[model samples]
Target: HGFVQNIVIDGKNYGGYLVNQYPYMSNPPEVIAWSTTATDLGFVDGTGYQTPDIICHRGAKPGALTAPVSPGGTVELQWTPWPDSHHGPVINYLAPCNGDCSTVDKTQLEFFKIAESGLINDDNPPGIWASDNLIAANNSWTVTIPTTIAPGNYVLRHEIIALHSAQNQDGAQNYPQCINLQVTGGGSDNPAGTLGTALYHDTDPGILINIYQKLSSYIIPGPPLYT
Candidate 1:
């Protein structure tokens, strides 16, 4: 959670401009959470793992908490690509904050997935979804807000589950990022879904799978999307 003006990826710029922030990061005397895994949800128990945070700021939480977006409008992230050196799927989830998202904790955040991308091994399993492939090809990825969702303040949780090393215990890395939003719409329907921590058990097949071998299908881990 540092200071920033514009979010630039590759060459193009995505203006999710940020204001004053905290936790100055440094190259020397690096913090564990801000190393390769850089910014995250915060630390879990004292484990190196990035468990979802009870507070909004982990090591470097986004300063631009309220990004104006609308149903059918797209929320784009200008990712600073270090590449997906460890191959895996990328996914996105949405959770209504009920009010201001800045103060909400993990236990209270109920998220429903709006988008998911998985490997498509050849045509047998079906080619990888373009949404999944798009993340791999570029440093920026955009997802649309559900046109059917009711107007409110919500958090769009974006994540990348790297399974390259997950064959071993505590190897899978979950990089979950939360983006807050003020959704503008007239619709009045709400659906129920699971919480962040409850979304995937450590032993869940999706999280505990081996990506080294060829697979027929990849089950995206999470509760079903709230239509």
Candidate 2:
């Protein structure tokens, strides 16, 4: 029920997609974050996990602006405060636009995992998850663009999978956001990526599981992070 409100790159603040206000503004503020039709700021659940909605949110469109950041630099995503009951993981991916992200076809983009955080502790029942840390960090998360990724126009996909009700079928909630990035000072690596629709299965262990017990590990859902 929340979306990114601002993005901080190297200490400079940039606006994010204003989901609630975009529809009313004749000329909305240009931002690096992609515009979404999810006006209610709802999540894409198990039923939509294999669809394009899983890629961003529902009816996501390219952003008019792209934020500039150097490889190895950090970008902080500040979200509207999240519910503490919505506990799960935070994951991030990067998909090369191959051209201008402002007009690229979303379905054609392929993504590679760059960051993921899951269960951090299991000492307590339903222990500490990444979502808990996100709340502790003031509803913000930081991601480091890989130092070896090639310079290009890319879409940064940041997501949270809330598992509070995951014990039931189609209960997991996926909140994903996309932002355009112009990566500068790059290296030579352009790792292969997975198509967005192919990233997760509705039945993946991590996508549908019970976290109410004393657990030992969490299997993050999706392709492995680019090494």
Candidate 3:
């Protein structure tokens, strides 16, 4: 089924948080790994319609209603209804997992590992770790939800435990992914205008100047709302 904004109407408004099929069943095993990619199903059921597919911070108490949250580091999960629905606030249901959500090896875990940008990049060899909380069995269902992340794009990941260490896999822990948030809230306080979520592209000086001049025409502050 398609989505309106990020909500779907199947018996009621049940969607998001992870699977496109909330009240419904999720995709096959493999595909579920990237279930979060379903933009249409980005949020969970609001209105307490059915079993909340994605509770903001509830424990992963499968089947029926999930357990209530412990209260602390309140993670406000919000979602809007389809633009036309014109209902109430895009009801936001809480998540089942409270701590770590990486239990079922099928979930794609997104971590951040500073690229090997030589020594100038910072640390000697550079380090990497899960940008978001590790989603392991008990972990995924417990990791605190971030009320605020850099407004950008981020991939839902597993509840892993370690990032790197001298005694990691083989010899060191290996991290390959990084959570890329859009960084919302406010913009940079700059007098020379604001730098958007994008970068300026140019190779030639004269061409660059010409492009810069033309670029000013397309200059837009901040990034997409994704709301």
Candidate 4:
């Protein structure tokens, strides 16, 4: 039930799209985060997992602004306090815009997993998930841009999949947020990516599972991370 509130890069703060305020604005403010018409702090569930809605929440649009950063640097996403009952993994993906991200078509963008943190400990029942770590880190998650990624305009897709209710059909909740980024001072590698709709399936083990048991591992949903 939370969303990214701010993004920090090189000690500079950039605001995230204010989903609640977007509907009322005659002129919306420009931000690095994409705009969404959804007013509810809700999530896309199994029913919409294969649709465009899952790409960046419901009715999402590109952001008017893009944040500047360099390859190998770190980008910090700060979200509002999350509920303790909601536990899951935190995942991040990057898609090269191949052009200006602000005007790019979101559906055409290809994504590759850049970072993921799942089950951290299995000693306790239900164990400790990445969401727990996010809360412990003061509601912030940091991701390091790949050192070998080519310099370009990219879309950073970050998400958290809450599995507390995942035992049931279509019970998993996916909260995905996106931001535009311009990578500077980088290498020459450009990894292949998967289309957003092809990222996950509703029946994937990671998308439908019970965390109430003493689990030994978690299968992160989506393409393998590009090294």
Ordered from best to worst TM-score, the candidate numbers read: 4, 2, 1, 3
Write the residue-wise lDDT of candidate 2 on 114-160 in tens digits: 99999999888688899999999999999999888889889999999
Model 1 ranges with Cα > 4 A deviation: 1-22, 25-51, 54-64, 122-132
Question: Which lDDT tens digits does candidate 4 get at residues 78-112?
Answer: 99898877899999999999888989888998999
Error of 3 at 129 (Å): 16
Per-residue alpha-carbon lDDT of candidate 1 for residues 78-166, written as tens digits (9 for 90 to 100): 54442444455667787787876665555577778888876755453223443346446565566778878788888777766666566
TM-score of each: 0.73, 0.97, 0.20, 0.97
| C-alpha local distance difference test of each model | 0.55, 0.90, 0.21, 0.89
Question: How much is the lDDT of residue 157 in candidate 3?
Answer: 23
Ranking by lDDT: 2, 4, 1, 3
Better of 1 and 4 by lDDT: 4
Report the Cα lDDT for residue 72, model 1. Answer: 73
| Candidate 2 segments exceeding 4 Å error | none
Across 79-118, the per-residue lDDT of candidate 3 in tens digits comes to 2221211111111111112223333221222222111111
Clash pairs detected, candidate 4: none
Q: Tell me how far the alpha carbon of residue 58 in candidate 4 is from the true structure, in angstroms, after superposition.
A: 0.5
Worst 10 contiguous positions by lDDT, candidate 1: 28-37
